[PDB]
Design a protein around this nucleic acid. Structure first.
Ligand SMILES: Nc1ncnc2c1ncn2[C@H]1C[C@H](O)[C@@H](COP(=O)(O)OP(=O)(O)OP(=O)(O)O)O1
Ligand SMILES: [Mg+2]
Ligand SMILES: [Mn+2]
Length: 538
DNA sequence: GACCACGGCCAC
DNA sequence: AACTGTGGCCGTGGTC
């Protein structure tokens, strides 16, 4: 293009280069803008941010987050990544999008600015006539990008000293287990190396191998294999406890305290908006969507996520969300009635599994019932179900048989979804979000049936993800007017931060917004809690 | 140092 | 192990 002087006219597309992927930690190396067949390159990128009224272009949110870090309100606008993502959610990176729609993603701000301009023109053209995708763009994704930027720049408070203390405690317990594993094995080795562990269990000891690994065909040492050997030899039990502790220490307890930001004093994740095949968000650097919650030690870790002094955390989580979505998408009269009566299938399955009254279902039990209910739903095999529940094969077929005959319209919707996917090549959510699934007519059975399971899962998971995104878009401005903050999204859950004297009002309002976001044929029910820490608030 | 594949495992 | 699905991060082992 023709090189013009900074600043650019209003409505220009931005290009920028960061020292590293994380916007809260990145040095803004370069900044440029393109419009009207010209390119503007900024002499000093930080100063030049003040001139922009809007971040418009590829990865707009990332630049908006960095502007918020500097005390500038530079909201993100159009982003060709979002247009490409709605056209085909396999469009996840600028490298691919550029190569697919008319450019090349380089490492220079000016070229990235001119690329953003061209890619928006072409992609906006590809979307002419796709009115449902355009609705999702204007009413969900583009406004959501602004919400995410604020969430990323706000961060979450963490009890650092608490986790440091915990690390030393967990370390001592790890050494006790390690020392005994070595004693039973008769010698020491790297207990973290699954290759070395394989030899010990299956060659040195006489333990039988139950399964092989996918890519390399080694004898597996996964938890499911060890649980099957848990009493065939004691050492296994110690290995399972070792694995749990080292997993939590190396993934959460030790890395997280070192990631507190110096200006904010808080922990900052990234909410990736074009990263999944179903329309879900993802979280990275660090992932705050997989913080432990299941085991007693996991809960000690979750307690480290706390509220600023004078504030409280508010946590909202949809009830049995993808089951309610299934009722609406399938139109099953039997299943609709289950939620109109305020029933809970996870609690029911839990009582069934454990042979105890519903009043005796602890959280750990209901947690296991969810894997069953969603495993069966999305196609688990009878044999595996028998092994997961330690019951004969015949009883497992019957559970799967009962499960689906209770709701006949479900398998009819599954088959309808698959037929539509084979005709058009894609499946879609309630709002029209698409996932292309071409393997539905593959001649290899395993490849075909895998595609099938991915195919009819996406409309359910994706619709639930659509609803949450829409709720976040509606809820955010209401929270600003109350002086509250939106902190995290965990697929079907939101964590907020609110002043203590407005905490109760915020919880009531957020609950209502999330439940009436988009009424379905079944009521959406939301559980909400308030506490000084993330665990207390659920 | 920077990559990567792999097996494994945390959450939804 | 795997006819549940969606993610991201770990250490190991390897290459460059
Ligand atoms: N094991 C799994 N397999 C497949 N999908 C899953 C699995 N676990 C969770 N999901 C999906 C379906 C859930 O509706 C959705 C949100 O998870 P989650 O909130 O834990 O469960 P839930 O909303 O069904 O129950 P709850 O009433 O406890 O909130 O994620
Ligand atoms: Mg949840
Ligand atoms: Mn839920």
């Amino acid at each position: 293009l023709e090189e013009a002087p900074w600043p650019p006219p209003e409505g220009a597309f931005v290009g920028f280069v960061l020292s590293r992927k994380e916007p809260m930690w990145a040095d803004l190396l370069a900044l440029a803008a393109a419009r009207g067949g010209r390119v503007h390159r900024a002499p000093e990128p930080y100063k030049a941010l003040r001139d922009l009224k809007e971040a418009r272009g590829l990865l707009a949110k990332d630049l908006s987050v960095l502007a918020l870090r500097e005390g500038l309100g530079l909201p993100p606008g159009d982003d060709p990544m979002l247009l490409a993502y709605l056209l085909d959610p396999s469009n996840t990176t600028p490298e691919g999008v550029a190569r697919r729609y008319g450019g090349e993603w380089t490492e220079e701000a000016g070229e990235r600015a001119a690329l953003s301009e061209r890619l928006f023109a072409n992609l906006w053209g590809r979307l002419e006539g796709e009115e449902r995708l355009l609705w999702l763009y204007r009413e969900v994704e583009r406004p959501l990008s602004a919400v995410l930027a604020h969430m990323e720049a706000t961060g979450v408070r963490l009890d650092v000293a608490y986790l440091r203390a915990l690390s030393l405690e967990v370390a001592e317990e790890i050494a006790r287990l390690e020392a005994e594993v070595f004693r039973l094995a008769g010698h020491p080795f790297n207990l973290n190396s699954r290759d070395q562990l394989e030899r010990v269990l299956f060659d040195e000891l006489g333990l039988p191998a139950i399964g092989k690994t996918e890519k390399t065909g080694k004898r597996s040492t996964s938890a499911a294999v060890l649980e099957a050997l848990r009493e065939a030899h004691p050492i296994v039990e110690k290995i399972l406890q070792y694995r749990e502790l080292t997993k939590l220490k190396s993934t959460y307890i030790d890395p997280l305290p070192d990631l507190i930001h110096p200006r904010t004093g808080r922990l900052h994740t990234r909410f990736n908006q074009t990263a999944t095949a179903t329309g879900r968000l993802s979280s990275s650097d660090p992932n705050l969507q997989n913080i432990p919650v299941r085991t007693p030690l996991g809960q000690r870790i979750r307690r480290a996520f706390i509220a600023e002094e004078g504030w409280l955390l508010v946590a909202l989580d949809y009830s049995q969300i993808e089951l309610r979505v299934l009722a609406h998408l399938s139109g099953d009269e039997n299943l609709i009635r289950v939620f109109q009566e305020g029933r809970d299938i996870h609690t029911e399955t839990a009582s069934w599994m454990f042979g105890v009254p519903r009043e005796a279902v602890d959280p750990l039990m209901r947690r296991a019932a969810k894997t069953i209910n969603f495993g069966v739903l999305y196609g688990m095999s009878a044999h595996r179900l028998s092994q997961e529940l330690a019951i004969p094969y015949e009883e497992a077929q019957a559970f799967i048989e009962r499960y689906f005959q209770s709701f006949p319209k479900v398998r009819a919707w599954i088959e309808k979804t698959l037929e539509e996917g084979r005709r058009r090549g894609y499946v879609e959510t309630l709002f029209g979000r698409r996932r292309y699934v071409p393997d539905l007519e593959a001649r290899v059975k395993s490849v075909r049936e895998a595609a099938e399971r991915m195919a009819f899962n996406m409309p359910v998971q994706g619709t639930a993800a659509d609803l949450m995104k829409l709720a976040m878009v509606k809820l955010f401005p209401r929270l600003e007017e109350m002086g509250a903050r939106m902190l995290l999204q965990v697929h079907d859950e939101l964590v907020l931060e609110a002043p203590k004297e407005r905490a109760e009002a915020v919880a009531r309002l957020a609950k209502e917004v999330m439940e009436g976001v988009y009424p379905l044929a079944v009521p959406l029910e939301v559980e909400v809690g308030i506490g000084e820490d993330w665990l207390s608030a659920k």
